[PDB]
């Protein structure tokens, strides 16, 4: 188990049988599941692996066993394909893209609990603050914090958002949104 520092990504769609659908066993909850089935296949690129998942939530940490200096930049470009890929599939059945993505970085510790329960999990200060970014997101874009905003090395475009309302942190902080990666 290690402590150090790592970046974490959190993702979840609000358009998962909650809008105005009647709920059907056929076609429904199968085309959306086919989208997420394309994300795990596209995983093979860098040091990334799926950790925790209760229901329809999807979160990936960069704190994999083998850590790289550019762990913050590994998810920064990965979040650009999260929206790009989930945009080609439209026909048949017209569905919008209300996908909400939230980023965060900081101290991350490995779980791995012996006996009593078969699980590896992931916990830390960063993992806790990566969820609130998702739950409280407008339009349907990626929400980046100040921490990740400091790790860009003049290679990423970020736009200021502002402040909202929080209960966990208490004091609100300036948030940003990643548009595209700077490539000369």
From Swiss-Prot:
It comes from the Bacteria. Residues 1-184 are cytoplasmic. Mg(2+) binds at residues 12, 56. It is found in: Cell membrane. Residues 7-134 form the Guanylate cyclase domain. Belongs to the adenylyl cyclase class-4/guanylyl cyclase family. Homodimer. Can also exist as monomer. This is Adenylate cyclase. It comes from Mycobacterium bovis (strain ATCC BAA-935 / AF2122/97). The gene is cya. The chain holds residues 245 to 428 of 443 of the full protein.
């Amino acid at each position: 188990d290690k402590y150090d520092e790592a970046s974490v990504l959190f993702a979840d769609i609000v358009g998962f049988t909650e809008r105005a659908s009647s709920t059907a066993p056929a076609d429904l909850v199968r085309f959306l599941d086919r989208l997420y089935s394309a994300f795990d296949e596209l995983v093979d690129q860098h040091g990334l692996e799926k950790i925790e998942v209760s229901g329809d939530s999807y979160m990936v940490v960069s704190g994999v066993p083998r850590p790289r200096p550019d762990h913050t930049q590994a998810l920064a470009d990965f979040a650009l394909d999260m929206t790009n890929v989930a945009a080609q599939l439209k026909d048949p059945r017209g569905n919008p893209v209300p996908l909400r993505v939230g980023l965060a970085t900081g101290p991350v510790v490995a779980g791995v609990v012996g006996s009593r329960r078969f699980r590896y999990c992931v916990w830390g200060d960063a993992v806790n603050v990566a969820s609130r970014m998702e739950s409280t997101d407008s339009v349907g874009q990626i929400q980046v914090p100040d921490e990740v905003y400091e790790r860009l090395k003049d290679d990423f475009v970020l736009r200021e958002r502002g402040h909202i309302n929080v209960k966990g942190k208490g004091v609100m902080r300036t948030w940003y949104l990643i548009g595209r990666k700077v490539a000369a």
